[PDB]
Structure formats: C-alpha cells, structure tokens
Amino acid sequence: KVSKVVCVGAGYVGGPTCAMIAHKCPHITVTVVDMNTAKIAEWNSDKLPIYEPGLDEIVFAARGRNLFFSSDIPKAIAEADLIFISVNTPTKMYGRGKGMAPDLKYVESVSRTIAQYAGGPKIVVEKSTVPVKAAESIGCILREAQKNNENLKFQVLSNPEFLAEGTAMKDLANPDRVLIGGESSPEGLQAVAELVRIYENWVPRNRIITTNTWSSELSKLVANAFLAQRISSINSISAVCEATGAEISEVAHAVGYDTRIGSKFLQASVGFGGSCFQKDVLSLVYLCESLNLPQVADYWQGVININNWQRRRFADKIIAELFNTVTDKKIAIFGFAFKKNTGDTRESSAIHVIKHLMEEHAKLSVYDPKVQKSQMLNDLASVTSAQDVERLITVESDPYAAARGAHAIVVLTEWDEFVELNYSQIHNDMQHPAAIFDGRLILDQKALREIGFRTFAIGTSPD
Amino acid sequence: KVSKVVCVGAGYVGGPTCAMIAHKCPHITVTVVDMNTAKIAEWNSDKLPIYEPGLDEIVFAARGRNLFFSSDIPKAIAEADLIFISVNTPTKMYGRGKGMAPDLKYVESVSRTIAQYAGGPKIVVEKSTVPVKAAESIGCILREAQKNNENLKFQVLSNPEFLAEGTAMKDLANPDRVLIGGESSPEGLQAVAELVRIYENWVPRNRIITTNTWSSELSKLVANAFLAQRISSINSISAVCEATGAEISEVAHAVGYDTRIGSKFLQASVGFGGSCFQKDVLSLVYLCESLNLPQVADYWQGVININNWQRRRFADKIIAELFNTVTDKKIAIFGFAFKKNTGDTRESSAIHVIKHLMEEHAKLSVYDPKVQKSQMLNDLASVTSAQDVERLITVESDPYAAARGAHAIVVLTEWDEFVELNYSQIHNDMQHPAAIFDGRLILDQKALREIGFRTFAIGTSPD
Amino acid sequence: NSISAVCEATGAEISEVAHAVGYDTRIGSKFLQASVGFGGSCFQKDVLSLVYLCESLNLPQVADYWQGVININNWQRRRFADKIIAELFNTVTDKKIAIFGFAFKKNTGDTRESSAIHVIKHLMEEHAKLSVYDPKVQKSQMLNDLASVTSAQDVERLITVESDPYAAARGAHAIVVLTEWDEFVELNYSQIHNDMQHPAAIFDGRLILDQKALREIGFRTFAIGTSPD
Ligand SMILES: O=c1ccn([C@@H]2O[C@H](COP(=O)(O)OP(=O)(O)O[C@H]3OC[C@@H](O)[C@H](O)[C@H]3O)[C@@H](O)[C@H]2O)c(=O)[nH]1
Ligand SMILES: O=c1ccn([C@@H]2O[C@H](COP(=O)(O)OP(=O)(O)O[C@H]3OC[C@@H](O)[C@H](O)[C@H]3O)[C@@H](O)[C@H]2O)c(=O)[nH]1
Ligand SMILES: O=c1ccn([C@@H]2O[C@H](COP(=O)(O)OP(=O)(O)O[C@H]3OC[C@@H](O)[C@H](O)[C@H]3O)[C@@H](O)[C@H]2O)c(=O)[nH]1
Ligand SMILES: O=c1ccn([C@@H]2O[C@H](COP(=O)(O)OP(=O)(O)O[C@H]3OC[C@@H](O)[C@H](O)[C@H]3O)[C@@H](O)[C@H]2O)c(=O)[nH]1
Ligand SMILES: O=c1ccn([C@@H]2O[C@H](COP(=O)(O)OP(=O)(O)O[C@H]3OC[C@@H](O)[C@H](O)[C@H]3O)[C@@H](O)[C@H]2O)c(=O)[nH]1
16 A cells, blocks of 8 residues: 655646645655756745646645655655656657657656665656656666566556646546556556555546556547647637638537537637647657558648647738738737646747747737746747847736837737736727737627727637 | 428438427428429338438328428428428539539529519528538528519528437437527528527527527538547547557547547547538538638548548458458448448448459448448449449348358448347358458457457457 | 568568578579678769769669669668667667677778768767777777768767777667677677666677577667567
8 A cells, every 4th residue: 555655756747746645645645856956945935836726725735744845866766655757758859750759868767766766666657748658668667677676576557647737736636537557467456556546535436547558648648639639620710710700709609519529628729838739749640650650640730730820820910910010019918828827838829929029020028927037038038049039028027017008919828817907098008009919819809899909819800 | 480381302301300390399380392202202101211210200190290291392382481491412523612512503493493482471491411601592592582572571591400310300309509590680680580489399598509691501510520520530549559559449438538528429430421521521621722721621631531541441451351352252241321220321431341342352242221222232333333233242131141151241330230149150150260340349359259250340459 | 681671570580581592592692691781882882883874874774773772771771770769769868879890891990881880870860879899990980980970079979989899888778789790799798788777778780699698688689680579
C-alpha cells in the first residue's frame, strides 16, 4: 500500500497533481522535487510559481503536513513507494522528427537517477499530457536495473493527465476519467491496483480505466487530437460565416444541439494554444509517418494547418481594415495567455499575432491580468529580437492605460475582466476613428457599434 | 393555422416525416405526393416502399384517415395550406461543380408547379438532409410568382430534417433539434410561427431553433460534416491500432469518457455510407472553393479522403490475407445496406468493397435481411456491368446458404442478426481454413478464434 | 545491401541469403558482404564517371541504370544512421556513442569516401558526443575529414579520438561498428558492457560480431541484414 508519493517535476502538471493527492489523501505523504531550486523555493513561499484558481488554498492547507517541496531529488527517490515522472519532453529542433517529435532526454535522465537511488522496489508512473513512448523508455531503463540487481523490483505505469490549465483544481478533484496503463503480469496488476487505490480515495471506480501501457498513451494522444480538431473545425467554419453573412456563434449553437456531437469545445477563436494540442497533433502526425500511414498523417495535419491559417488571417484582417498601415500606430492588446485564468503563455496565439503586428512596425501596449511581464518580453524576444521588443513593446498593468491613445484594440484571451470594462470611456480616450478586433467572441458587437467603434469579430461578417 | 399539409416527395424524408405529423396532429390532413405513381401505389399497399422500424404501424394506423398518398399533384397543391418539398437534388455529373454540387432541377420544377396550382397564399417549406441554396431557388421562383399575380402570397422556409435512417420513427418523435429558417419580416416571422406551432404538438419549445434561411441551411451542412468527421477520425486511428497492437474499441471507449468529446458516433467501420454524409461534405468543399477558401475546402476534403482510404485498405487487406488470390473463391458477404435496420443502399460501403472483390474475380454470395435483390443487382451493375454481375454475384435469402462452401466471410453491415448466428455450423460448412473479416466490429474475435477461424477485424492488429 | 533491408523486414538473414546465392558459380561467392556502404577513392568516383559518360553519349537509360548503384549506397548509409537514432527512442542528444572504425575498409589508414564520415556526421547533427577509435587512421586525418563535412567548431565540441577501443566505449550509450578490423572481433565485450551505460546498445554495420553472444551478455544488439526481433 502506497503511503509515500514523490513526483519529479514541479510544473503545471506535477504541482497541481500532487496538491490534490495530498488534499484528498490525509494518510499519504506527497513530496514534489525539481531540478530548479529557485522554483521549489517559490512553491514553499506565499507566491507560487504558477497561477491556478484554487491552488493557493489547497497548497497552503497541506504544505508542511503531508505536502512537501524539496530540491533533494535522491533523498526523495530513496524514500518513495511510488514516483511520478512529470518533466518536459521538448520538441526536437534537429535530426529525425525535427519540429515534430518529442525529445526524451529528461525522462531518461530521471529514470537513471531513479535506478541509481531507488534502493528498493518502486512503482514509477509517467504522468504528462502528451505521452508518446515515454513510459516505454522509462521501462527500458528500469528493467535493466532490475536485471542487474534483482533487489530493485520496478513496475512502470502510464497515467496521463487530463487536467486543463485554468480549471486544474476542478478537473483534478472531479475528473471525467482516470487512465492507467501497465504491463499485464502479476507484478504489473498489483502496481496498477495500488495506483487505483490511491485515486479511489476520491474518484469513483466506474471512472477509472485500466489497460496496457501503450493503449493508455495512444488514447491520450488521440483524445487530445480530437479536442484540437473540434476547435479547428469550428474555426474553419468561422471563415464561411464571415463570407456569407452567418454568425459562427449561431452555427455552433445549432450544431451543439446534436447530443452525438456535443455542445462543448465549439467556441471559435484566434487559434488554440497551450503546451498540449500543437505538440500532440504533430506527435500523432510524426507517429503516423513512421508507421507508413501517410493518409493518416495528412488528415491530422489539417488541424494544425487550419490553426496556423486562423492566426494568420486574423492578423492580416487587422492590418487590411486599418488601410494596410499600422506603422507607428499604438495598438492595445487585451490578453497574452493562451487561455483565461492562467499565466501560462506556451504556444499562445497572442505571440504570433503580436509578432505579425511588430513586423508592421506597430507600437503595442499589452495587458494581461496574470502573465508575468518578464515572461511576455522573453516570449516576444525569442520570436523577434531583444531590440525589436524594446522599440515596439510596452507592457501595461492597467488595460485603460494600454487603450489610452490607441488606434485599435485586439482581444486575444477570453478573460472575463475584458467583458466588464467601460468601453464607452475607452472609446473617448482612443484615437478616432477607433477600431476593435475580437478574437475571442466575448464582446457585444451591437453595443460596441452604438458606442462608435469600427468593430470586428471572428465569425462575424465585417459589414 | 395550418390544417392541410402536402409534401412533394414520398421518399425516405417525405414519407416518414408526414407519417409522424399525422400521428401527432389529429386535426391536420397530410397528403404525400410524388411524381412516381408506382411508388404512390406501394405507399397505398400493404408493402410500403421503404423499410423503417415502426413505420409500418404508423402509416397503417392512419393510411386513409388523415394521411393519404395521392398521384393527383395539382389538386393536392391547390388545397394545401403548407407544402413540404422533399425531392432529389442529385449530384451533378457534368459542368460546374461536377460530382460535388447538387442539381436543383427537380426542386425548381416543383416550385414552378406550386406557382401554377397554388391559387392562393401558401407556406412553402424546403425539407431535406443536405440543403444548400435549395430554399433560395424556391424563393427566387415564388417571389417572382407573387409579383406577377399578387394574389399568391408566398413565404419560403428552410426546415432541414434531422432523422437518421433505421431510427427514423424514434428520431422524428423525439428530435434533438428542429431547425427552422425564415425571412426576417412580419410575414416571414408569422410563417415560422405557424410551422413552430405544428411541431409544438409533440416537440418541446427548447429544441426548436429559429433563425434566418441561410443560417438554417449552413447549420445543417456543418452539423452533418461534424458527424462525418468523427467517423473518419476514429477510422484513421483504427489503422494506427492495427499497426501498433492496440484495440480501436478500447481507444474509442477511453476517448468518449470526455464529456467535451462525447461518447457517441465513435464506432469504427469499413466506411460511412448514406445519401447524406458524402454529399454533404463534398457540398461543403465545393462551397468553400467558391468562397476562395481552399484552406477550408482542403481541411474538410480529408474526411472524404479517409473514408475512401478506409474502404480501399479494408478490401486490400482481405485479398492480401488470402495470399493475394481470390480467383474463383466463394466469398460470403454479410450485409449490403449502408447501416442496420434499413433497406437503403445509397453510397453503401458494401458496393465499393464488393466491386473490389469482383475485380479480383471472386464469386460473391451476398445476404442482407432487408435490401431488395433487384436493388443490389442494379447497384452492382452500375459500378461494374450487368455482365460482370451475372458471372460473379449470387444473392441469398439465408446467411447460412451464403456462407456454405465459402472461403471467407466479410461483415459489412452491423445487423444484429449476424451476432446470433451459429458460427460453429458456419465454420463446419466453409472451406478449410475459413477466414472472416469484421468491418463493423460486432463479432467476438476470441470466440471466432476458438472455433478455428482465421479471424480479422478493423482496428485489431492481425497478429 | 538492398537485399539486406528485405531480410530485416521479413525475418531472414543476409548472411544466409548471401551464402546461398554465392554457391552459384555463375554469380560467384566473393563480394557479397553487406555493409553500411562502400567507400574508397574508386567505386563512387567510377560509377559517377560511368554515369556521366553515358549522359554525354545520349544513353540516359544506361546512366539511370548505373546511378542506382550510388542511390542504394547513399540510402544504405542514411537508413543505418536513422536506425541507430530510432532504436534509441529518437534521442541521442548529448549521449556518448563509441565508433569502432573510421577507415573505408580494414588494413588501411585510407579514409577517402569512408562511410564512417557520413554516419558520424548524422550523429553529430543529433548532438551526440562521439568517441572514435580506429587502429590505423591518423587522428588529424579524422578531424580534418569530419570538419570538412561539418565545421571545425562542431568537431571540437562533439568529437574525441581515442587510441584504445575500451576508452572509447567506457561510459558510452552505444557502440557503432563501421569498419571490419579483425581487432574488433576478439574484444572483451563483457567488460565493455559492464563499463557502458545500461542498457547498452551496439549496432554492427559490418556483420563481424556474434549477435547471439552479444544478446546473452545483455546488449541491445542490432546488425545490418538482421531483423531487430
Ligand atoms: O530533468 C528534469 C527536467 C525537467 N524538470 C522539471 O519538470 C518541470 C516541467 O514542468 P513544465 O511546467 O515545464 O511542463 P508541464 O508540467 O506543464 O508538462 C506538460 O507540458 C510540457 C510537456 O513536455 C509535458 O509532456 C506536459 O505534461 C519543470 O519544472 C522542470 O524544472 C526536472 O525537474 N528535471
Ligand atoms: O472551444 C474552445 C476550447 C478551447 N479553445 C482553446 O484551446 C486551447 C486549449 O484549451 P483547454 O481548455 O483544452 O486548455 P489546455 O490546453 O490546458 O488543456 C488541454 O491539454 C491538456 C489536456 O490534459 C486537456 O484535457 C486538454 O483540454 C486554449 O488556447 C483555448 O483558448 C478554443 O479556442 N475554443
Ligand atoms: O420532381 C420530383 C423529383 C423527385 N420526386 C420524388 O421525391 C422522392 C425523393 O426521395 P428519395 O428517397 O430519393 O430522397 P430522400 O427523401 O431520402 O432525400 C434525401 O436524399 C436525397 C437528397 O437529394 C435529399 O437532399 C435528401 O434529403 C422520390 O420518390 C422521387 O420520385 C418528386 O416527387 N418530384
Ligand atoms: O459511429 C458511427 C456512426 C455512424 N456510422 C456510419 O455512418 C453512416 C451514417 O449513418 P447515420 O447513423 O448518420 O444515418 P443517416 O446517414 O441516415 O443520418 C445522417 O444523415 C441525415 C441526418 O439528418 C442525420 O442527422 C445524420 O445522422 C452509416 O453508414 C453508419 O454505418 C459509423 O460508421 N460509425
Ligand atoms: O563484399 C564487400 C566488399 C567490399 N566492400 C566495401 O567496398 C569498398 C571497396 O573495397 P575493395 O576491397 O574493393 O577496396 P578498394 O576500393 O581499394 O579496391 C577497389 O578499387 C580499386 C580497384 O583497382 C580494385 O580492384 C577494387 O577492388 C570498401 O568500402 C569495402 O568495405 C563491401 O562493403 N562488401
């Protein structure tokens, strides 16, 4: 029976996951470790290294009791009964599968430390949002360790995470499902049962799916791709609505009435972001190519092609509607995170849209309620340059200051705060005529028009 | 208030729809008309021209009371309050959008007939499963008619049909949504109000969507495409399962637990059929190309590409597993309809699969519980030839006669009857070794393996 | 070499096929030894010279025919390096890989058109750190060869040359055999296995090692012309 859980990786996955375990399992001790010593110190402070609604209350109530953050990875490894691995698998920027395949270097190095410091039987659980052959590389390394020293009985399991950032605590406390994969053997079934037993402290058995290792990873890979496909499908139709005088919001509403389709994840946008979806579909495309399934690869590649096309055509419409010139024009950007209720900016559509406007020599004032300032500048500099950010980018802590004197507003993240702003007062303090471009479909187009905006929105005909 | 309903078109749409209207509206007289007087006679005989579960009880229940099938089109039109148009819009086999766009020649002719014989104000409602600009052509003709003879006050509505065949009576009685589009004017809103009034005799208000005409048609066109994309998405992953040793049934089960995705319409198959999905997706592709949106057109084209690829690779695997030769081998085919619980064969996957086996000079014995023999032979002759069908095709009324002496069984339609067969008796009376290929995932592979079959199924690795 | 891929895909052994093929005196039994690809200052230059002669004689069909000899050789080198990377979970980033052999064949210091150059470059482009041992090739010759296809700086950070095969293999994740030196047969592969990272992989591009013996030592062992199962 597991009573000591360790997780290597104190990120958006590892942190929240362990916090919920400690919150729901009083008799389990949870220790989170990370190579980043400064990041662990933040987890132990009153300002956590990430923003998640409800995370502070959960962590502060468990930290020091049964939830711990340490930088002594070997000590945690040695004392664990079960060890989560939740580290990066950054995409390969060279070689085979360049720009498509994950690089497993971190997963393997952690596995070697586990082999080096386990000192006894361990259950090792790979937990990420895009697992593709990651558990197989852990098992490869661990099997050898057992082979070389039979005192180290290791069972490797696959338990991908399903949380969405911004709703992580709600998702972790009441998941639609829990997916666990392991080898079909006596020791494998026992290890799965002990992980199931942990989740059964708060997850009903009928929502826990157990299978083999590869099925678990493939199901996660396919599930993520299905979600991205819904977004790209409704986004592709948003262009049809603009061209024919229909409203994508009405089309999505009518489509969702079919219970066979479902009504969720039919919200058009400037394009999906996040560390999961693009990496996931490209990983599926790369997997299919390596299996000699070109037909399949082409099918799923369309989800990425539409996403890139949606971002590009949105930025182009901004420029075209401003008479093809934004040179030296101040433009306010509402939103930088890839979705609301998070400070995470990985693969945010705001990065690509702002870059396009920078290439037009616009001066951009960006506001986001939660994204760190240094994070925005590093993101923008890595796609352009440090100098380009210095001349063109201004970061504001107040949306009215960003809009003051601006020629245009661009909404890129669906923060609820952006709905409740005083757009009448904003219109008085902008340059005239004032334009606004809604890339998230959260604003009242008719009301903005009556205020006097030249107003535009994805999925609405520009006239 | 409407009390006299006419529908021009006594097919799979017009017939069932009118039956349900009469069944739920005792005070409304519904007359179904059709150019085919022979088809009308079948509606008036004890063998209805289509098979739909529960349809026989309902028509029979009212055939003669308030529901009638007539061949006198002018008298029915002149006496009607509301007129459904549910006729064919066959795909163009030449000229612009050849093999992609519908031919509205019949819809137009019907509108002209209505104009000639209305003799008074009428509500005209275009009702089909793939509406694309059909209602606008009706209105173009009828608006002209009104202008010329002002006595004729016409209002054209779009009311797509949401039923799925095989479950038509249940769908018509409890639809997920009723979609109605109309002109935004006093007369337009009133015309919608009276059609909404009809459906409210048995459909709750919260499932009735009212919008403008074009929004109604685009919503139906997009909803069908979303449905087809789910099937193509799961079919593409079934090849990944075959290549990597996973089971598509397990993957689909795990995917469907996400309420954002939904668990329905994830059943893999040899490929989707029916007069709707392919016609609809190709119609969307053509619409996009016309709007200068190749990007969008290409995205949705992938749904068709996968469907063709799924049929092709399934037939290719059958031949490859029989050592690349089926010359003069008897092969039993279980299923010909495009889905279960219907006699409809339009765009059935069995047509293309049987054609592939015919080109390999196989002798095929086909059994389907409901498809007319003459229907199969005409379908197969139109893609090959009457002479080819004579030499290679045998139609059986008994599945055991089809399987007797066969080298292989190929399951193409998910009829419940195929599960409950005595596969021990079938195995004993087949050639040995006996092979079986499940293109619908309805059979127990382990059980077939235990009987002694060389057994295969889409989405299961063939070893 | 082209048939060696067919063996890998269907579970046959290229050594056995070559042995059976060579028993026909009309074919002859010599020169049927599979490899990562032929090298030397002669063959590639010669076939390319023959191809060019045929093009100038307006004999393209003939030119296309002989060009296939070069195409397969390049394809054999590329797919071998790709198999190394794919078998190591598609990542060799910063992994130490030992290279056994640099000369284009055994019993010479000549490196001209050696297949080892092309294979090492592919591993360099994957950011692997390569430790090279060859019994006769000059150290300066290897470094100049590798730098001329990549860059001097790339060679400085990624290439180290050893005078002892055990030093090259010490701490390595994989062994890659590229030249058929007899010395490589009689090495102590158990001691090498103990001093490598675990699990240890070995890729035989010359078909000189005993696969069954390497497997029993505990290697993940691979060889051109043997199915990796
Ligand atoms: O060797 C390592 C590598 C990485 N890490 C740590 O692992 C953590 C990774 O967390 P991140 O927030 O970067 O990523 P997430 O936890 O959100 O993971 C998610 O996105 C990145 C993808 O590669 C993962 O597959 C996915 O689960 C970092 O804090 C990093 O410091 C180690 O502790 N050791
Ligand atoms: O309807 C929608 C839904 C989502 N999106 C966008 O798509 C992106 C992803 O949004 P999600 O809510 O899925 O957030 P995440 O990317 O964190 O979660 C996703 O990846 C990790 C998996 O474990 C989750 O199950 C999956 O939802 C965001 O950029 C969001 O703005 C839309 O544009 N429209
Ligand atoms: O001018 C005409 C043409 C055709 N018809 C009749 O209308 C009936 C059409 O019924 P079908 O079963 O062929 O078609 P459905 O009712 O299933 O309609 C469905 O498939 C065909 C597509 O064109 C439609 O868009 C779709 O809704 C036929 O019986 C035909 O004889 C007329 O009454 N008048
Ligand atoms: O999970 C599935 C679902 C369906 N299918 C196949 O897809 C094809 C379509 O079957 P449907 O159940 O959609 O039947 P229909 O085509 O008659 O109905 C469809 O078109 C008319 C619309 O009004 C309906 O809403 C739509 O479902 C069938 O061949 C079926 O076998 C699958 O292969 N897998
Ligand atoms: O069976 C074999 C034989 C040779 N090879 C390779 O082919 C390449 C050539 O080796 P050789 O033994 O032909 O050596 P050389 O290239 O020096 O001689 C060759 O070119 C010069 C001519 O004069 C010689 O007659 C010719 O043999 C080497 O890379 C060798 O490893 C194989 O891969 N398999």
